[PDB]
Every structure is written in C-alpha cells, then in structure tokens.
Paper text:
Here we report that covalent modification of K-Ras(G12C) at the tumor-specific cysteine results in the presentation of haptenated peptides by MHC-I. Using a naïve human B-cell derived Fab (Fragment antigen binding)-phage library, we identified a recombinant antibody, P1A4, that specifically recognizes K-Ras(G12C)-derived peptides modified by the investigational inhibitor ARS1620. One clone, P1A4, featured a relatively short heavy chain complementarity-determining region 3 (CDR3) as well as a remarkable selectivity for the S atropisomer of ARS1620. P1A4 showed similar affinity to all labeled peptides tested in this assay. Together, these data confirm that ARS1620 serves as the major antigenic determinant of P1A4. Our study demonstrates that MHC-I peptides derived from covalently modified intracellular proteins provide an unique source of tumor-specific neoantigens which require presence of a somatic KRAS G12C mutation and its modification by a covalent KRAS G12C specific drug.
Residue numbers in the entry:
A (entry chain A): 18 to 230
B (entry chain B): 1 to 221
Write the structure that this text describes.
Amino acid sequence: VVTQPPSVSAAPGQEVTISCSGSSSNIGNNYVSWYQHLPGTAPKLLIYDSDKRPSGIPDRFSGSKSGTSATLGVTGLQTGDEADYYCGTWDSSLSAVMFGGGTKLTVLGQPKAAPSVTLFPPSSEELQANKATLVCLISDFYPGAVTVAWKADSSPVKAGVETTTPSKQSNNKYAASSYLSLTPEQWKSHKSYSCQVTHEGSTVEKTVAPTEC
Amino acid sequence: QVQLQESGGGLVQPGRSLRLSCAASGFTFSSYAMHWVRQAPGKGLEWVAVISYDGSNKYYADSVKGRFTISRDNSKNTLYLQMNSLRAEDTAVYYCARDYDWQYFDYWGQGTLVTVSSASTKGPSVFPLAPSSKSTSGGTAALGCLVKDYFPEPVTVSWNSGALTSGVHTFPAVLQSSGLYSLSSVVTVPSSSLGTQTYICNVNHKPSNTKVDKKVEPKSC
Ligand SMILES: CCC(=O)N1CCN(c2ncnc3c(F)c(-c4c(O)cccc4F)c(Cl)cc23)CC1
Ligand code: NA
Ligand code: NA
C-alpha cells in the first residue's frame, strides 16, 4: 500500500532522493522511519520521526515528510550506500506496521545498458512430460534492477510467475530470469505469450506463440 | 552491547507448525516491545508481528493473523513466534527486532531461514532451451537448459564437460510453489557452429547423487 520507486541511481559524489507514498491512515498521520538493507544482513536505521538521525548516521542522510508522502535524501553518494531502502510506518486503520515496497539504490560504476531479452517457449520434451514452462532470460543490463510482467495474449498474468533477483555475469553486467509455469492446455489456448521487462523507464517485450517456432 | 539471536528455522512441511525463538542480551528485555519481520526470496521486507513489553498488546500482519502467535518469556529473555498452518508463501528469513518507544526498530538479529516444502531429495529433470529458428550464419545464438524440479539445493552446471566456459551464465534457482527448485543455464555461441558443434549441459545434483547430461540441438523448424 505504501509504494516507492523500484530503482534509483546516481554517480559517486552525487545525490538522490527516494520517496514513499501512502495515505492519511499511515504516512499522513504517523511516524515515518527509513532503513538501509543489504539482504543477508540486518536492516540499519537511517532516519526516525521523519527527519531525525540516530547517532552514527552522517548528515548526508536526511528525511522529510509532506502530506501523505515521505522522502529520504542521500548526498555525497558512495558505493557503500548501494543497498535496498525501505520506509516504515504505522497504519492507524489496520493497526499494523507497513514497509514501503523498497527501492534499490545503485551507485553508478559502469555504463547504463538496456537488457537483452530471450524468451524460450516450452520445449517439445517438456510438453511431452505434460508441463509447459516459458523461460524469459534477461541479460547484459545495468543498473541491476528490472520489473518483469507476463501477458497471455494481452492480459496480465500473475499466477505461476517466479523471477530471480539480478546477479552479475562474467562481464560485470547483470542478468535475471523469469519463469511462467503453465499447463500444456493453458499454453495452447492462447494466441501468444509475452515477457515484458522494464528497465530504467524503458520496456523490452518479447513474444512467443504456440503455433510458431 | 545489545545482541539478538534467532533460532528454530529450517525445513518444515506445508500445514505443519514450527516455533521460532529470539534470545536477547545486552538490555533489560522486559522494558521493550519486540517485533518479528521476514523477507521472502526476492521480496521486500514484510512486518509480521509485535508484542508489547508485558504481552498485553500484540499486533499481526493480516497475512499471518490467525495462524501465527507471538509470545515472550521475560524470565528467559526470549521472544517466540509460533507458526501454524504453514504455507509456501511463508518461506522467508525471519528476523526479530527490538522496538524503540513504539517509534522505530533499533536492533535486529541475524535471522533464521524457514523453508516450507513437502519435498524429499529428488534429482532434476533437464530440458533443452533450443536456439531460435531465426538463427542465420553471421550472428549469435542463445541456447541453454532448464533444470527443474529438484531438491534440495544445490545443482552445478557445466557445458561440454568444462570445455565450454566463455559466454556461460548459470542463474540462481527459484523455489516453485510446488516446493521444488528450478534454474537455468544459458550460453551464447556462434550461429555458424549450430550444425557442427555439439552442445551438452552437464547437471550435477550431489544430494541425490544424480548427474544429467542433456544434448541441446536446433529444433525441427
Ligand atoms: C500497545 C499500546 C497501544 O495501544 N499502541 C497504539 C498503536 N501502536 C502505535 N501507535 C503509533 N505509532 C506506532 C508505531 F510507529 C509503530 C512502529 C514501530 O514501533 C517500529 C517501527 C515502525 C512502526 F510503525 C508501532 Cl509497532 C506501533 C505504533 C502501538 C502503540
Ligand atoms: Na550494482
Ligand atoms: Na555454471
């Protein structure tokens, strides 16, 4: 319910802001705090009470709140800042803590690169095993953050999707993978399927069809 | 200093139950509310529950309300999370966190991983990801293999018995809703080579002592 942009980036020494957008029951009327998280480690408190810094957090981290939105500002970016950032808050209507969706902060260290997308239809062998997996492989992109969406003909598909977190290739760019697990009957009962990959406000869509090789 | 240590995580079957514990160290435990927070593979942080200093106030995320019970024992400096009726979507690293003044989280544990799957040890099925029929000599082709439905991790993948390493990328595994893992390995090769060079992916699954070699070749299109 509290949303944040998926990705933000800037070069070392530059600055970024990250905002999360809520409603009056949560961000509007409640304490907002911000956390830095590198998965596999423990989240770290950056900002509490919308704009206070704990001891040990440098002044290049700052926060503000305006209406139903809250903003974290980071100046003098350094590579140690590359992490996932979450705002957290209380929702008075639900009586629950809500985290924003998270924003990956990339500190740019190499050229931006739009993804290559390779979409494999189910193999003949897998179909003969009574299964149908579409394999969307996403490669050679940077920053390492993408949003993947699947379409059957032209309608959104959410069931049966699994997507990996981007990780580095040998050439130091990122790759990720997404799977759509279908029934062979679900597969053959549509004119086409599409993997749509959004990267830095730009979208690459690949399409396959049961009737075409 | 203040330290927190979770434990109890591991493999558990759907529908069954599991109890997590969080031991606390460098502070007066009975003066603080305590939270559970979790992170499912590839998802954002998700708050789970909180319990006040004396347990008279507890709150739960809707996604777990009615299935999970948060409790504490202030005489043993321990926080508990009783998880019942476990579902695949409960697979996650679970963290405990100390509350400060009903305002923010200030200290966290290391986490403990919980995997919900009915699966036993099972070797993979390997299917080919054949190169596009639109490949013409003068370009490059992506081919690969889909390693699916194995348990537990890990699988290793090589190509042509280690002879082919340039241009290979093996992806992390996903845990499918079935309780089983899948991953892919892909290699970019010259389209020129597709009618002459054999490409074989070598999949080793040590936990099941299974090795699968799959030949990946162009389709009949
Ligand atoms: C048990 C006493 C009681 O009735 N209440 C009211 C609701 N409730 C809260 N009221 C205001 N802000 C809160 C709040 F900011 C949080 C909170 C926190 O303690 C830590 C991180 C993020 C949060 F939103 C939490 Cl868990 C509860 C809050 C808990 C305190
Ligand atoms: Na990066
Ligand atoms: Na490999």
